[PDB]
Structures are given as C-alpha cells and as structure tokens.
Design a binder for this molecule. Structure first.
Ligand SMILES: [Mn+2]
Ligand SMILES: [Mn+2]
Lengths: 294, 160
C-alpha cells in the first residue's frame, strides 16, 4: 500500500507555487482505490456520525485550496472531517485531490468521511474533466478503477441524530431513512429517483413544494418542504453543498438548511469564498471561511 | 522561489436569531467568523480551458457502443506491403460529420498481412493500435497512427 509515503509525496508540494503536480504511480493510485472501496463497503451507506466534526462542500479538483483547508482546519487526525462530495471535475488537479482524500480515509477510517457527489458518477465525470485528466496523466483503465470506487461511496450522513448531510438535497420520494439504507452498492446513479435527488436537488426560495430543476435533472424544493422533513425526522438542520455560494456558506429557510461550498473562486469563473462548518461536542455550529487574497 | 503566506481576519459573526425552537438541539455561534487567506488568482490560476463537454459527450456516445462489442487482441507482422487493410470512419448516429468517429475495416487486401493472419475482417472496429486509442477519432488521425506502425503491430479489435 505504501500509505505514509504516498501521503508524504502528496503533501510535499505544500510550499510550492500552486499548480505543481504530484504524479503517483498507477499501482499506487489503484491501491488507494481498491483499499478505500473495501472500507466504504464495510461502513453504512447512511453514515451515523458524532461531533466534533468539520464539514466541507465541493472541492472540484482545486488541490491547493484543499491543502489550505487542511492547513487552517487542521490536518487529519487533528480534526474529524466529513466531505459532501464533488471532489473531481472542473479543476486541473482532481487526481491529487481524490488521492489525498482517499489516503486519509484509509489511514483514519473512523475519523474521516467522504460522501458521494453528483460528479462521483461516470456519466458526469466523463464529461466535466476527470476522464480527461485520467486519460492524459494515466490511462482510461485507471478512470474505470475510480468509477468502481465511487460507485461504493456512502450517500448521506446524520450527525448526532440532528444534522442530515447529503450533496444535493431532499427527494419527493424520501419518507424513511430505511429507503437510503436499503440501497445496495456498488451502484450507478440513476437519471431519476431517490438516489438521483439526493445528489442533484436544490432548495429554491421561490417554489412552493416541489418544482422543476433548471439543471435538467431532479427537482427543486421550498422552505416548507424543509420544515416538514426536519419535524418528521426529529432533525434540526440539513447540510448540503452542490451550489456555489458567495460567502462559502448560505442559509435557507431561516437556518433550517445550509449550503456549504469549499472551492474558492470556483474554476476561476466565480469570485466566491469557500467555507467549512464546525460542529462541536455541544452541537454548536460555527463557520470558517477560505477567502482568496487580493 | 515561492513563499506561501497565511493569515486570519475576523468578521462579524452570525446574528442572534429570533426565538429559536426550545426543542432544537443544535445552536449557532455568535462569535466572530474566522476568514483565512488562500491563494490569489494571480498565484493560483483556477481556470481550466481544457474542459469540453460537447467533445466529451460525442466521444462517450461512441464508447458506449464499443463495450457492447466483444474485444479481442490481434498481432500483425507489418511487411513491405503494409498491414493489408483500409479503413472507414463512421459516426455515432446519422450525419455526425468528421470529428469523433469509429474506425472500421473497409477492406482487407488479398494476400496482405491482415488477410493471411485470418482474424481481422471487413466491418471490424479498430479499438486500439500500438497502444493508441482509435475510439472517437478523425479518420486522418487513424491513418497517421496506422502509417507509423512498424514490425509486429498490436491491435485491439471489436466485432458486431
Ligand atoms: Mn459541484
Ligand atoms: Mn454537485
């Protein structure tokens, strides 16, 4: 496995000008995929987690921003982490990003957690850059190995029976958490239905109930849908990612839902900050912001 | 000689909220929010002009058909007459133009290297030649790959 060597080489560029690649061997990356896959399958598809925990949204291959997130938030195992998905695509360094994340999952499997985003799906990351990065830097076979791994990622987490976490959001079909738990892995993400919605849906302040999603996939949901869901399941907050938000976090439905996004100046086409949410042992939630310098 | 620099600024925290439900267990800090410094755009170019969803999806439609095919390796000795095959590019559907084609065997020359080997036949798909993928390429790219082959040439072949 060579795990500590791999981690050392990934972190070697901490002091370099951003953009410098770390080129691990094919056999190394394959080992990270196969080992992390076993671990994902051995843990529930619906994670049950306890505070303290730091929660992060999309990274999208912005490897140097991930390094800063750990710098400021505390490198594993100093802090426990839950990432909400979308590790790959769009950025130039999806490989370094996912390899570091998988390496920490392997090293600290009970204190480090990764959910599946909509971009951890072959039909999406084929198109938005990850396949290209794999083909350019390695080979297509390695992209298929990543797919096999991503197909085993858990889909949602509940923090201290009070914070429901997923990449996208709610589903009109979600009535019982057992619907999530009965999902068998490995699985692809379908074009519609519960699993699709969990990875694809968005809150909309302008919709009453459920509406159509501008993305062409899944749905939008209003503030009342959120309130009803939380009351039903005795939950306090939905924590999700999946949308660029200017300050890195943004509340919805008063403070019943939060969106976290952790890729600052997203693909150089937005001027946003990234953020992470800390949950302490008393379940106090706070925000830390990552803002690009001027 | 790059020297990364780090720092922290505080900004106003979350506002106190009006009457939060007594049964709510989580609560939100009113303390100042830590704003940490990451790289500027000048220091870290986050743009990526290499993403091309239109080209990717065009390649992908073609790829989906090939995995319905059974793939088999072929090795040919390239002699003075060449490989003894001609090729044709076909699109993933109707009237797709020239960009992202499947490369099919149009002709197997009588007496040529492909012919006497016996395996490759008309309408076979050329998936890979000397380690280079030919799935979703132009016909001119394919022709260049095939021209540049030498000695014992290694193929992956698909058949309807
Ligand atoms: Mn995303
Ligand atoms: Mn997303």
């Amino acid at each position: 496995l060579n795990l500590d060597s791999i981690i050392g080489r990934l972190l070697e560029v901490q002091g370099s000008r951003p953009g410098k690649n770390v080129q691990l061997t094919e056999n190394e990356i394959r080992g990270l995929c196969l080992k992390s896959r076993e671990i994902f399958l051995s843990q529930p598809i619906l994670l049950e987690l306890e505070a303290p925990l730091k929660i992060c949204g999309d990274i999208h291959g912005q490897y140097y921003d991930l390094l800063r997130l750990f710098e400021y938030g505390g490198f594993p195992p100093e802090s426990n982490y839950l990432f909400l998905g979308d590790y790959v695509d769009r950025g130039k360094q999806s490989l370094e990003t996912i390899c570091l994340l998988l390496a920490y999952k392997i090293k600290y499997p009970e204190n480090f957690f990764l959910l599946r985003g909509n971009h951890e799906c072959a039909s999406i990351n084929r198109i938005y850059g990850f396949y290209d990065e794999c083909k350019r830097r390695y080979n297509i076979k390695l992209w298929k190995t990543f797919t096999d791994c991503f197909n085993c990622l858990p889909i949602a987490a509940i923090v201290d029976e009070k914070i429901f976490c997923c990449h996208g959001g709610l589903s009109p079909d979600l009535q019982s958490m057992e619907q999530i738990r009965r999902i068998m892995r490995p699985t692809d993400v379908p074009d519609q239905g519960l699993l699709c919605d969990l990875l694809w849906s968005d809150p909309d302040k302008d919709v009453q109930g459920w509406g159509e999603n501008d993305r062409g996939v899944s749905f939008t949901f209003g503030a009342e849908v959120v309130a009803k869901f939380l009351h039903k399941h005795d939950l306090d907050l939905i924590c999700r990612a999946h949308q660029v938000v200017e300050d890195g976090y943004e509340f919805f439905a008063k403070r019943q839902l939060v969106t976290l996004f952790s890729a600052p100046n997203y693909c150089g086409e937005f001027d946003n900050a990234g953020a992470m949410m800390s949950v302490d042992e008393t379940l106090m939630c706070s925000f830390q912001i990552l803002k690009p310098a001027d | 000689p790059y020297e990364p620099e780090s720092g922290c600024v505080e900004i106003p925290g979350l506002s106190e909220e009006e009457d939060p439900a007594p049964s709510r267990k989580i609560h939100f800090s009113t303390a100042p929010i830590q704003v940490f410094s990451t790289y500027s755009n000048e220091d870290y170019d986050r743009r990526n002009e290499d993403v091309d969803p239109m080209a990717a999806s065009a390649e992908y439609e073609l790829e989906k058909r090939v995995e319905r095919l059974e793939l088999f390796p072929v090795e040919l000795e390239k002699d003075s007459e060449g490989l003894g095959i001609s090729i044709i590019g076909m699109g993933a559907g109707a009237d797709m133009g020239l960009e992202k084609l499947g490369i099919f065997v149009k002709t197997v020359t009588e007496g040529g290297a492909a012919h006497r080997d016996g395996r490759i036949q008309v309408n076979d798909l050329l998936v890979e030649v000397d380690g280079t993928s030919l799935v979703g390429v132009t016909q001119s790219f394919a022709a260049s790959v095939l021209r540049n082959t030498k000695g014992r040439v290694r193929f992956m072949i698909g058949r309807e």
